[PDB]
Amino acid sequence: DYIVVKGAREHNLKNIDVKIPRDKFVVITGLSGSGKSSLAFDTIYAEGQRRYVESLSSYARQFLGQMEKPDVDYIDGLSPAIAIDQKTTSRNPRSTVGTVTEIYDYLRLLFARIGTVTIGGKNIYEVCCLSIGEAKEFFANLNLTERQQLIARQILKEINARLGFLVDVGLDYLTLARAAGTLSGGEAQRIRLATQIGSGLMGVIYILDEPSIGLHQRDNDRLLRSLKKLRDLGNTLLVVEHDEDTMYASDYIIDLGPGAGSHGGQIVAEGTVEEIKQNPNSVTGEYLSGRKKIEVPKERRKPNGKWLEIIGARENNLKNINVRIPLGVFTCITGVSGSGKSSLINEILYKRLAAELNRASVKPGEHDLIKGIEYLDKVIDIDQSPIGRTPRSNPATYTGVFDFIREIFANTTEAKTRGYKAGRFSFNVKGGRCEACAGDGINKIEMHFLPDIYVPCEVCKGKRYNRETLEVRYKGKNIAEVLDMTVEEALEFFKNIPRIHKKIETLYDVGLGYIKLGQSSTTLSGGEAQRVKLATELSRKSTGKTMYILDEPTTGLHMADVHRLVGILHRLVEAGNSVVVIEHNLDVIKTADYIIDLGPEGGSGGGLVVAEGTPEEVAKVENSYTGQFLKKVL
Amino acid sequence: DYIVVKGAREHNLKNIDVKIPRDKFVVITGLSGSGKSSLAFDTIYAEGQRRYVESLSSYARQFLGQMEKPDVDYIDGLSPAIAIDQKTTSRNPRSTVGTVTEIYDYLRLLFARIGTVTIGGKNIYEVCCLSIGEAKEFFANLNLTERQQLIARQILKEINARLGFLVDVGLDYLTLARAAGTLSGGEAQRIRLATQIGSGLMGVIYILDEPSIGLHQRDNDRLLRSLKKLRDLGNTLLVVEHDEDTMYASDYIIDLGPGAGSHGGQIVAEGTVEEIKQNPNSVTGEYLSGRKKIEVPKERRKPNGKWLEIIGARENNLKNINVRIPLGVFTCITGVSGSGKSSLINEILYKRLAAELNRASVKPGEHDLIKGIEYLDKVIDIDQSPIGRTPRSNPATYTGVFDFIREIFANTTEAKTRGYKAGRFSFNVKGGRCEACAGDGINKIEMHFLPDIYVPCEVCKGKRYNRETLEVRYKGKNIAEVLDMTVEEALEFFKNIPRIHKKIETLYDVGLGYIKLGQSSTTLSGGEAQRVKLATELSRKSTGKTMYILDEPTTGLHMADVHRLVGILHRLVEAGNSVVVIEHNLDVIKTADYIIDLGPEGGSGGGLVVAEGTPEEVAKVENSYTGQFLKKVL
DNA sequence: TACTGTTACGGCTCCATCGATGGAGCCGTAACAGTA
DNA sequence: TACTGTTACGGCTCCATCGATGGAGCCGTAACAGTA
Ligand SMILES: Nc1ncnc2c1ncn2[C@@H]1O[C@H](COP(=O)(O)OP(=O)(O)NP(=O)(O)O)[C@@H](O)[C@H]1O
Ligand SMILES: Nc1ncnc2c1ncn2[C@@H]1O[C@H](COP(=O)(O)OP(=O)(O)NP(=O)(O)O)[C@@H](O)[C@H]1O
Ligand SMILES: Nc1ncnc2c1ncn2[C@@H]1O[C@H](COP(=O)(O)OP(=O)(O)NP(=O)(O)O)[C@@H](O)[C@H]1O
Ligand SMILES: Nc1ncnc2c1ncn2[C@@H]1O[C@H](COP(=O)(O)OP(=O)(O)NP(=O)(O)O)[C@@H](O)[C@H]1O
Ligand SMILES: [Zn+2]
Ligand SMILES: [Zn+2]
């Protein structure tokens, strides 16, 4: 009936007790860095996997891999659990849709056990090179004999369920032979969801960590309907989401908070959506109830006569459209997943602007020409791919600050007298780091089947530096203490140095005032990593006439975080710059002064400019789903 | 709280609903063939394993191996389960004790992670070639540094728990370098128990199928104390046992019945031991309450002046003892497990009697000479090893009956006119079997990861024979119907043929009147297989002066079955023969007219004749545990 | 003279046991070029 | 002349992905020898 958890202190959870109902729709909400992922995936899923693995033999444990033991005391009512990780997975080019979704293995088994080899007048190759919808239709009309049906009932059932889920989510325009490495974000997310939650089971806990990455509102609604259908089978659903639709379509909501990092990790509000709204201490309830919201501008800026014309854009699935992008205003490029907006913007506009301004060597997409490039001076872009996590990377090194800090540290009098350079003051370069731990600071000993044990180094005491490097101090603080201070302390510490102060203020402006400069990248959260990347790309100097291109910056960001980002972008636009954002979040779109809509479908059915104009104008077009969704908001 | 199971119809269960309490000691009792193993290991363990496996990936499922789906509807309250199979496992000579118990892997990990390689002034080899007790003492006195203790805490804990369990069960005389293929039955059983139930867990269901194979009463009591200690950790224990001690030391007993085979598969009585005793419908309660029991003879037969003297027996661990075996009476060779009774009897007495009577070519053990061999004519022996299970074997072929049946079938007029032989009338010989199914009758299609599906053959319709072979009938019945009749029908069908009637009556005398002549060996139960082997060895002709040697014939036999066997043996002895039985069951021992006791311990501490004489005389020796246990019974 | 032990010999079935490689991202370093 | 774009290049880290063999037992068949 319940999955009651008591005494949870993993990561930053402050010894909280949470009771999760079974066989229901439960949503974990909170700010970026609250501790939702550490609460679900790092505690409940870890405990379930460890308990199910300890009962197996040593050989099976070695061949599977046990995860770390959660720092939780009481966990009861658990069950076999299937979890989908928040982090995106990169697929090698050899992988295909059928191989990833495992439909290819079922097809091979069916053809080996039933092939006389053709099944229903079709060999393996012609059904492998087939669209999902027509493959489902062909498999639902099979007329094999009774003996074959008895032999291969389970294979047929699994294939039918998987193809039904893939059709339900809205992915019937793809082919089983399509490479997985050439798909959009939303399509790849749907494929990943279909891989695990495709063939549903009974009495199994399902854990989903933000399953709506790069999905439109229509795709999100379809996925929600599929999830409700799956839950009706008698399963438990635990979803960590920042979306309003998922919060509204749920039976129970557990809200963490009240902040992020060291200031969060507790439970603030619990109950249904209304109880969340009526609780003052809940930030999510405050945003849902409308007490705090992203302000829609009554007056929208008009273009100043300067336009960016894209003529003959036919890259990927684009059907030779002409799109005009106004300059000097905030423009949002919206559309259903797979409609062809990223393949337009990031593959033509940015790849041409960089080539013509930053002297890059990137070949753009298939297009005729772009008019109006002379009106800009530089282009700054944020890709849709996530950041790479390494233990040798921290936000200080990520946002180009470590170079300046090492330079100033090497510029001190003691460093000059000792004949040192900036290389010594880094833990990734031989000479200044503690060679016993190779600059790691902590040591991770890995066993064969038992969980790993982390033992800190005793030579450096976790400071990653030897005595010689730590003997030189700048303004009374060494480099270890410089790396150990939060972003607010660095801002208060580098006031008189504009070069470092600019980047530190950029980091602080996105809401990372609690993040230590030396916190490991692997330990960073998804939202914190996204904000770190945003600060990295937004800390660069702007000339007043520049293009800002953002590809889904809402990934892993709460309502407060996207409100902060919207304010930053609006100030940047008011400074004189022009911003183009590929967005799926309605809050960001409703504040845009111009919208370019693509559709009306995804895949081969899209690539046409359905709507173009201000949000009020777009809301009057019933053909586009974006207009239908914007009509309710306005 | 409960593991409630409803709608169970696997094998021969007749749609019964059973509620099993959690965190308790539960014993499943019943006759041989009732359905206890099919109720626990084939249903509850199968469901638990399948549910825990379905949540893993396809690769993990392929690398692990999913078992068959039980034919059960409702199962709730399950948990990760560890089960020990009833069937004994044969180990290759390369295996050792440490390798089997996995202590060798933990030792290697500890020496690789802590070795400077010597730990505590000892290398790997000197601790590998060490006794269990002294190894435990050495590991409990380790004085490694704090950092090493923090690094290797889990390895030390696991090693200490495993060695503690091995010492508790009573294996302190063994060495980690001892080959697993040269151990006794009880020692191998205890090693198998230590492999899985050694390092206990929390909240895990433990399923044990007859864990007291070849164990004395003292060893059984020690194992029971260990099991109670394990259950006190907060686990559930489900043991399928025929022992009285296990039934008495339990919290709940679920009794199946009321018979065996098609006549059983239901639930007769439930509750504690007293409630079982007070239920008339329960056979186990009737035997426990003393209403039905194995009768102890008031007068015991005395030796007739003919004795079998073994002089200088020093095989294995025997310390050069001289043992006198009376002839013409029932003799039981008893002692603690590992004391050296099998290595005496089956390695000297039988191996010399066969060589001197049946003209065998087996080299006996290390002994000086045996006097009195001229007093016997032949020797019949039953080994302690279990039978081999193959789908090409059935009880009719096992107990030498199929040869006679094929001979008489080939002797018919139609077979003579058609020019056939006895080879055609067998499903393991080309020519008479259905070549489509190769005589298997049923077809088992095996997948990669999905459970196998059994589809019967359509050419032969499961009769394993073609039309030509089935066209010839003897006494109105073909060979398929001859194989399809039970043992009672065969007894009523072969009344006028003494050769077949003798073997059929021998099969029926052990309680196998419901077993079809063509039932597969792999589908046979452990007790049914043991009784089949007993009938095979007891169906041979006796000359009136012959030696019968039995090595633990109680394996898998209920109280009623051992009562039937005791009656058979007593009638055989009264016929003029002499029977020597190596026994651990007190019911068989209390009826013996002479007992030879070995001990007083196992391994290197045993091999001495502690007691020798009638049970009343043996009960007066306090040095022997057998006497102490016999004192209470008498 | 036939029944009952042994042996060999061919064919069938069951059961125990023993992570590396390629692709991608990031950090530090160097060099080259455009612009205020 | 210094600040800010680009490129390359070496070293480090993370993540996705693709059952066979030997030993033992059993069945059918043949041959050989001892005994009632
Ligand atoms: N290399 C490629 N070759 C062929 N088709 C491709 C390729 N890359 C992407 N596509 C297809 O082009 C269509 C548009 O994808 P793309 O424009 O990259 O993403 P998008 O529409 O912005 N979706 P999303 O990022 O989720 O909002 C989809 O149907 C993709 O499957
Ligand atoms: N090893 C660690 N020790 C202490 N704090 C940590 C550690 N790893 C992560 N954190 C912090 O713990 C907080 C919660 O982490 P996590 O649970 O991953 O975030 P989250 O709330 O799910 N955010 P998001 O995924 O963006 O919605 C973040 O502020 C992390 O920086
Ligand atoms: N090949 C062998 N070499 C050395 N020791 C052996 C060998 N086989 C058995 N032993 C040991 O001899 C002792 C007696 O074993 P054995 O007499 O065969 O069994 P047992 O006493 O009848 N036990 P059980 O069958 O369980 O009642 C035990 O300590 C065995 O480990
Ligand atoms: N496939 C089958 N179909 C029908 N009956 C079967 C099948 N397999 C086994 N049986 C019979 O089902 C009965 C119960 O089997 P099983 O559960 O293995 O016995 P058990 O009661 O545990 N006996 P034992 O292990 O000796 O104590 C026996 O009479 C078997 O012969
Ligand atoms: Zn160090
Ligand atoms: Zn057939």
Side-chain angles (χ1 to χ4, degrees), chain B residues 11-12 31-38 86 210 242 260-261 514-515 519 523 525-528 556:
Chain B
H11 283 182
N12 76 295
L31 256 79
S32 176
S34 210
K36 313 169 299 297
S37 180
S38 74
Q86 161 175 22
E210 210 140 0
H242 299 295
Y514 53 82
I515 278 286
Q519 171 164 351
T523 73
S525 183
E528 283 167 326

PDB file of all heavy atoms in Angstrom, chain B residues 11-12 31-38 86 210 242 260-261 514-515 519 523 525-528 556, ligand 4:
ATOM      1  N   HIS B  11       1.754 -28.959 -11.759  1.00  0.00           N
ATOM      2  CA  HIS B  11       1.935 -30.403 -11.635  1.00  0.00           C
ATOM      3  C   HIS B  11       0.643 -31.098 -11.224  1.00  0.00           C
ATOM      4  O   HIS B  11      -0.255 -31.284 -12.051  1.00  0.00           O
ATOM      5  CB  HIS B  11       3.054 -30.721 -10.642  1.00  0.00           C
ATOM      6  CG  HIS B  11       4.428 -30.509 -11.196  1.00  0.00           C
ATOM      7  ND1 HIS B  11       5.572 -30.778 -10.476  1.00  0.00           N
ATOM      8  CD2 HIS B  11       4.842 -30.051 -12.401  1.00  0.00           C
ATOM      9  CE1 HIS B  11       6.630 -30.498 -11.214  1.00  0.00           C
ATOM     10  NE2 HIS B  11       6.215 -30.054 -12.386  1.00  0.00           N
ATOM     11  N   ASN B  12       0.534 -31.486  -9.953  1.00  0.00           N
ATOM     12  CA  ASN B  12      -0.635 -32.208  -9.467  1.00  0.00           C
ATOM     13  C   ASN B  12      -1.369 -31.481  -8.347  1.00  0.00           C
ATOM     14  O   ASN B  12      -2.191 -32.099  -7.661  1.00  0.00           O
ATOM     15  CB  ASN B  12      -0.238 -33.613  -9.003  1.00  0.00           C
ATOM     16  CG  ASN B  12       0.468 -33.606  -7.667  1.00  0.00           C
ATOM     17  OD1 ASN B  12       1.565 -33.069  -7.536  1.00  0.00           O
ATOM     18  ND2 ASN B  12      -0.161 -34.204  -6.664  1.00  0.00           N
ATOM     19  N   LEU B  31       3.391 -36.980   2.307  1.00  0.00           N
ATOM     20  CA  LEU B  31       3.960 -38.205   1.770  1.00  0.00           C
ATOM     21  C   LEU B  31       4.852 -37.899   0.570  1.00  0.00           C
ATOM     22  O   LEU B  31       4.847 -36.796   0.018  1.00  0.00           O
ATOM     23  CB  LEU B  31       2.855 -39.181   1.370  1.00  0.00           C
ATOM     24  CG  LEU B  31       2.606 -40.354   2.319  1.00  0.00           C
ATOM     25  CD1 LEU B  31       1.786 -39.908   3.517  1.00  0.00           C
ATOM     26  CD2 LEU B  31       1.921 -41.496   1.589  1.00  0.00           C
ATOM     27  N   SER B  32       5.631 -38.899   0.169  1.00  0.00           N
ATOM     28  CA  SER B  32       6.482 -38.763  -1.005  1.00  0.00           C
ATOM     29  C   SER B  32       5.618 -38.734  -2.259  1.00  0.00           C
ATOM     30  O   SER B  32       4.927 -39.710  -2.569  1.00  0.00           O
ATOM     31  CB  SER B  32       7.487 -39.909  -1.067  1.00  0.00           C
ATOM     32  OG  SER B  32       8.257 -39.846  -2.253  1.00  0.00           O
ATOM     33  N   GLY B  33       5.659 -37.619  -2.978  1.00  0.00           N
ATOM     34  CA  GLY B  33       4.792 -37.404  -4.115  1.00  0.00           C
ATOM     35  C   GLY B  33       3.562 -36.573  -3.832  1.00  0.00           C
ATOM     36  O   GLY B  33       2.707 -36.449  -4.715  1.00  0.00           O
ATOM     37  N   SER B  34       3.441 -36.008  -2.629  1.00  0.00           N
ATOM     38  CA  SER B  34       2.276 -35.195  -2.300  1.00  0.00           C
ATOM     39  C   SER B  34       2.221 -33.931  -3.149  1.00  0.00           C
ATOM     40  O   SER B  34       1.147 -33.534  -3.614  1.00  0.00           O
ATOM     41  CB  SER B  34       2.294 -34.841  -0.814  1.00  0.00           C
ATOM     42  OG  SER B  34       0.982 -34.677  -0.313  1.00  0.00           O
ATOM     43  N   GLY B  35       3.366 -33.290  -3.362  1.00  0.00           N
ATOM     44  CA  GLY B  35       3.421 -32.053  -4.112  1.00  0.00           C
ATOM     45  C   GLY B  35       4.047 -30.914  -3.334  1.00  0.00           C
ATOM     46  O   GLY B  35       3.771 -29.746  -3.614  1.00  0.00           O
ATOM     47  N   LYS B  36       4.886 -31.240  -2.349  1.00  0.00           N
ATOM     48  CA  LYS B  36       5.519 -30.204  -1.538  1.00  0.00           C
ATOM     49  C   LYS B  36       6.558 -29.429  -2.340  1.00  0.00           C
ATOM     50  O   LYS B  36       6.579 -28.192  -2.317  1.00  0.00           O
ATOM     51  CB  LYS B  36       6.155 -30.825  -0.295  1.00  0.00           C
ATOM     52  CG  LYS B  36       5.256 -31.798   0.443  1.00  0.00           C
ATOM     53  CD  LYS B  36       6.033 -32.577   1.486  1.00  0.00           C
ATOM     54  CE  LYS B  36       7.133 -33.400   0.848  1.00  0.00           C
ATOM     55  NZ  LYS B  36       6.576 -34.421  -0.072  1.00  0.00           N
ATOM     56  N   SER B  37       7.437 -30.141  -3.048  1.00  0.00           N
ATOM     57  CA  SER B  37       8.448 -29.466  -3.854  1.00  0.00           C
ATOM     58  C   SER B  37       7.808 -28.667  -4.979  1.00  0.00           C
ATOM     59  O   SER B  37       8.213 -27.534  -5.251  1.00  0.00           O
ATOM     60  CB  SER B  37       9.444 -30.478  -4.415  1.00  0.00           C
ATOM     61  OG  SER B  37      10.433 -29.831  -5.196  1.00  0.00           O
ATOM     62  N   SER B  38       6.794 -29.234  -5.634  1.00  0.00           N
ATOM     63  CA  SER B  38       6.088 -28.495  -6.674  1.00  0.00           C
ATOM     64  C   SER B  38       5.329 -27.307  -6.100  1.00  0.00           C
ATOM     65  O   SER B  38       5.105 -26.317  -6.805  1.00  0.00           O
ATOM     66  CB  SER B  38       5.138 -29.425  -7.426  1.00  0.00           C
ATOM     67  OG  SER B  38       4.007 -29.736  -6.637  1.00  0.00           O
ATOM     68  N   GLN B  86      16.576 -29.539  -3.986  1.00  0.00           N
ATOM     69  CA  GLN B  86      16.655 -30.848  -3.346  1.00  0.00           C
ATOM     70  C   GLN B  86      17.710 -31.729  -4.006  1.00  0.00           C
ATOM     71  O   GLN B  86      18.442 -32.451  -3.319  1.00  0.00           O
ATOM     72  CB  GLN B  86      15.285 -31.528  -3.383  1.00  0.00           C
ATOM     73  CG  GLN B  86      15.324 -33.031  -3.161  1.00  0.00           C
ATOM     74  CD  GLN B  86      13.941 -33.645  -3.082  1.00  0.00           C
ATOM     75  OE1 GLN B  86      12.967 -33.077  -3.573  1.00  0.00           O
ATOM     76  NE2 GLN B  86      13.850 -34.814  -2.461  1.00  0.00           N
ATOM     77  N   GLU B 210      14.546 -30.231   1.841  1.00  0.00           N
ATOM     78  CA  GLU B 210      15.219 -31.321   2.536  1.00  0.00           C
ATOM     79  C   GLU B 210      16.694 -31.003   2.752  1.00  0.00           C
ATOM     80  O   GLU B 210      17.559 -31.586   2.085  1.00  0.00           O
ATOM     81  CB  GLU B 210      15.060 -32.631   1.763  1.00  0.00           C
ATOM     82  CG  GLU B 210      15.054 -33.864   2.646  1.00  0.00           C
ATOM     83  CD  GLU B 210      14.038 -34.894   2.202  1.00  0.00           C
ATOM     84  OE1 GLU B 210      13.339 -34.646   1.197  1.00  0.00           O
ATOM     85  OE2 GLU B 210      13.937 -35.952   2.859  1.00  0.00           O
ATOM     86  N   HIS B 242      10.904 -34.336   6.073  1.00  0.00           N
ATOM     87  CA  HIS B 242      10.240 -35.538   6.564  1.00  0.00           C
ATOM     88  C   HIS B 242      10.699 -35.900   7.973  1.00  0.00           C
ATOM     89  O   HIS B 242      10.295 -36.937   8.506  1.00  0.00           O
ATOM     90  CB  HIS B 242      10.488 -36.714   5.617  1.00  0.00           C
ATOM     91  CG  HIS B 242       9.967 -36.499   4.230  1.00  0.00           C
ATOM     92  ND1 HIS B 242       8.625 -36.359   3.952  1.00  0.00           N
ATOM     93  CD2 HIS B 242      10.609 -36.410   3.041  1.00  0.00           C
ATOM     94  CE1 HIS B 242       8.462 -36.189   2.652  1.00  0.00           C
ATOM     95  NE2 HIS B 242       9.651 -36.216   2.077  1.00  0.00           N
ATOM     96  N   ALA B 260      -0.523 -39.575  -2.522  1.00  0.00           N
ATOM     97  CA  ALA B 260       0.586 -39.256  -3.405  1.00  0.00           C
ATOM     98  C   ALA B 260       0.113 -39.340  -4.847  1.00  0.00           C
ATOM     99  O   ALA B 260      -0.891 -39.986  -5.155  1.00  0.00           O
ATOM    100  CB  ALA B 260       1.775 -40.194  -3.175  1.00  0.00           C
ATOM    101  N   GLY B 261       0.857 -38.679  -5.729  1.00  0.00           N
ATOM    102  CA  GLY B 261       0.517 -38.701  -7.142  1.00  0.00           C
ATOM    103  C   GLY B 261      -0.834 -38.064  -7.396  1.00  0.00           C
ATOM    104  O   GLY B 261      -1.132 -36.968  -6.910  1.00  0.00           O
ATOM    105  N   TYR B 514       0.659 -46.097  -8.295  1.00  0.00           N
ATOM    106  CA  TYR B 514       0.077 -45.051  -9.124  1.00  0.00           C
ATOM    107  C   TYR B 514       1.004 -44.571 -10.233  1.00  0.00           C
ATOM    108  O   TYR B 514       0.569 -43.788 -11.084  1.00  0.00           O
ATOM    109  CB  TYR B 514      -0.327 -43.854  -8.252  1.00  0.00           C
ATOM    110  CG  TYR B 514       0.793 -43.336  -7.379  1.00  0.00           C
ATOM    111  CD1 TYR B 514       1.754 -42.471  -7.887  1.00  0.00           C
ATOM    112  CD2 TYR B 514       0.891 -43.713  -6.048  1.00  0.00           C
ATOM    113  CE1 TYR B 514       2.779 -41.999  -7.097  1.00  0.00           C
ATOM    114  CE2 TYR B 514       1.915 -43.243  -5.249  1.00  0.00           C
ATOM    115  CZ  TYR B 514       2.855 -42.387  -5.779  1.00  0.00           C
ATOM    116  OH  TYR B 514       3.876 -41.915  -4.989  1.00  0.00           O
ATOM    117  N   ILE B 515       2.256 -45.012 -10.248  1.00  0.00           N
ATOM    118  CA  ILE B 515       3.232 -44.509 -11.208  1.00  0.00           C
ATOM    119  C   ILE B 515       3.050 -45.230 -12.536  1.00  0.00           C
ATOM    120  O   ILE B 515       3.077 -46.465 -12.596  1.00  0.00           O
ATOM    121  CB  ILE B 515       4.661 -44.684 -10.668  1.00  0.00           C
ATOM    122  CG1 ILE B 515       5.008 -43.548  -9.705  1.00  0.00           C
ATOM    123  CG2 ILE B 515       5.668 -44.730 -11.804  1.00  0.00           C
ATOM    124  CD1 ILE B 515       5.269 -42.228 -10.389  1.00  0.00           C
ATOM    125  N   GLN B 519       6.199 -42.954 -17.357  1.00  0.00           N
ATOM    126  CA  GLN B 519       6.431 -41.608 -16.848  1.00  0.00           C
ATOM    127  C   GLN B 519       7.914 -41.266 -16.928  1.00  0.00           C
ATOM    128  O   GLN B 519       8.769 -42.078 -16.565  1.00  0.00           O
ATOM    129  CB  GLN B 519       5.932 -41.491 -15.410  1.00  0.00           C
ATOM    130  CG  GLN B 519       6.321 -40.196 -14.719  1.00  0.00           C
ATOM    131  CD  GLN B 519       5.508 -39.936 -13.469  1.00  0.00           C
ATOM    132  OE1 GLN B 519       4.536 -40.634 -13.192  1.00  0.00           O
ATOM    133  NE2 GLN B 519       5.905 -38.926 -12.705  1.00  0.00           N
ATOM    134  N   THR B 523      10.644 -36.057 -14.764  1.00  0.00           N
ATOM    135  CA  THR B 523       9.441 -35.644 -14.056  1.00  0.00           C
ATOM    136  C   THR B 523       9.239 -36.385 -12.741  1.00  0.00           C
ATOM    137  O   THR B 523       8.349 -36.011 -11.971  1.00  0.00           O
ATOM    138  CB  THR B 523       8.210 -35.847 -14.942  1.00  0.00           C
ATOM    139  OG1 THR B 523       7.915 -37.246 -15.037  1.00  0.00           O
ATOM    140  CG2 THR B 523       8.465 -35.296 -16.334  1.00  0.00           C
ATOM    141  N   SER B 525       9.731 -37.591  -8.878  1.00  0.00           N
ATOM    142  CA  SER B 525      10.110 -36.924  -7.645  1.00  0.00           C
ATOM    143  C   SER B 525      11.360 -37.576  -7.057  1.00  0.00           C
ATOM    144  O   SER B 525      11.791 -38.650  -7.481  1.00  0.00           O
ATOM    145  CB  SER B 525       8.960 -36.966  -6.645  1.00  0.00           C
ATOM    146  OG  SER B 525       9.293 -36.269  -5.462  1.00  0.00           O
ATOM    147  N   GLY B 526      11.959 -36.903  -6.073  1.00  0.00           N
ATOM    148  CA  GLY B 526      13.135 -37.462  -5.424  1.00  0.00           C
ATOM    149  C   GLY B 526      12.831 -38.745  -4.675  1.00  0.00           C
ATOM    150  O   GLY B 526      13.559 -39.735  -4.787  1.00  0.00           O
ATOM    151  N   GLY B 527      11.743 -38.746  -3.905  1.00  0.00           N
ATOM    152  CA  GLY B 527      11.351 -39.952  -3.197  1.00  0.00           C
ATOM    153  C   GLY B 527      10.912 -41.060  -4.134  1.00  0.00           C
ATOM    154  O   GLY B 527      11.209 -42.235  -3.902  1.00  0.00           O
ATOM    155  N   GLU B 528      10.199 -40.703  -5.204  1.00  0.00           N
ATOM    156  CA  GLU B 528       9.801 -41.701  -6.191  1.00  0.00           C
ATOM    157  C   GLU B 528      11.014 -42.295  -6.893  1.00  0.00           C
ATOM    158  O   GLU B 528      11.057 -43.500  -7.152  1.00  0.00           O
ATOM    159  CB  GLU B 528       8.836 -41.086  -7.202  1.00  0.00           C
ATOM    160  CG  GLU B 528       7.423 -40.929  -6.670  1.00  0.00           C
ATOM    161  CD  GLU B 528       6.565 -40.044  -7.547  1.00  0.00           C
ATOM    162  OE1 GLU B 528       7.108 -39.089  -8.139  1.00  0.00           O
ATOM    163  OE2 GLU B 528       5.348 -40.302  -7.645  1.00  0.00           O
ATOM    164  N   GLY B 556      14.349 -38.902   1.081  1.00  0.00           N
ATOM    165  CA  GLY B 556      13.116 -38.569   0.396  1.00  0.00           C
ATOM    166  C   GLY B 556      11.931 -39.448   0.717  1.00  0.00           C
ATOM    167  O   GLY B 556      10.971 -39.474  -0.057  1.00  0.00           O
TER     168      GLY B 556
HETATM  169  N1  LIG E   4       4.786 -32.937 -15.227  1.00  0.00           N
HETATM  170  C1  LIG E   4       4.071 -33.571 -14.292  1.00  0.00           C
HETATM  171  N2  LIG E   4       2.751 -33.762 -14.510  1.00  0.00           N
HETATM  172  C2  LIG E   4       2.030 -34.397 -13.581  1.00  0.00           C
HETATM  173  N3  LIG E   4       2.431 -34.899 -12.409  1.00  0.00           N
HETATM  174  C3  LIG E   4       3.738 -34.695 -12.220  1.00  0.00           C
HETATM  175  C4  LIG E   4       4.611 -34.057 -13.086  1.00  0.00           C
HETATM  176  N4  LIG E   4       5.892 -34.026 -12.555  1.00  0.00           N
HETATM  177  C5  LIG E   4       5.765 -34.635 -11.402  1.00  0.00           C
HETATM  178  N5  LIG E   4       4.493 -35.066 -11.134  1.00  0.00           N
HETATM  179  C6  LIG E   4       4.038 -35.786  -9.950  1.00  0.00           C
HETATM  180  O1  LIG E   4       3.595 -34.845  -8.994  1.00  0.00           O
HETATM  181  C7  LIG E   4       3.785 -35.389  -7.668  1.00  0.00           C
HETATM  182  C8  LIG E   4       4.444 -34.358  -6.787  1.00  0.00           C
HETATM  183  O2  LIG E   4       5.758 -34.063  -7.303  1.00  0.00           O
HETATM  184  P1  LIG E   4       6.828 -33.337  -6.370  1.00  0.00           P
HETATM  185  O3  LIG E   4       6.211 -32.080  -5.899  1.00  0.00           O
HETATM  186  O4  LIG E   4       8.132 -33.288  -7.070  1.00  0.00           O
HETATM  187  O5  LIG E   4       6.934 -34.354  -5.139  1.00  0.00           O
HETATM  188  P2  LIG E   4       7.205 -34.194  -3.547  1.00  0.00           P
HETATM  189  O6  LIG E   4       5.881 -34.255  -2.901  1.00  0.00           O
HETATM  190  O7  LIG E   4       7.992 -33.004  -3.173  1.00  0.00           O
HETATM  191  N6  LIG E   4       7.950 -35.562  -3.081  1.00  0.00           N
HETATM  192  P3  LIG E   4       9.407 -35.708  -2.373  1.00  0.00           P
HETATM  193  O8  LIG E   4      10.317 -34.705  -2.967  1.00  0.00           O
HETATM  194  O9  LIG E   4       9.940 -37.069  -2.541  1.00  0.00           O
HETATM  195  O10 LIG E   4       9.126 -35.455  -0.945  1.00  0.00           O
HETATM  196  C9  LIG E   4       4.555 -36.702  -7.838  1.00  0.00           C
HETATM  197  O11 LIG E   4       3.689 -37.824  -7.703  1.00  0.00           O
HETATM  198  C10 LIG E   4       5.127 -36.594  -9.254  1.00  0.00           C
HETATM  199  O12 LIG E   4       5.267 -37.869  -9.871  1.00  0.00           O
END
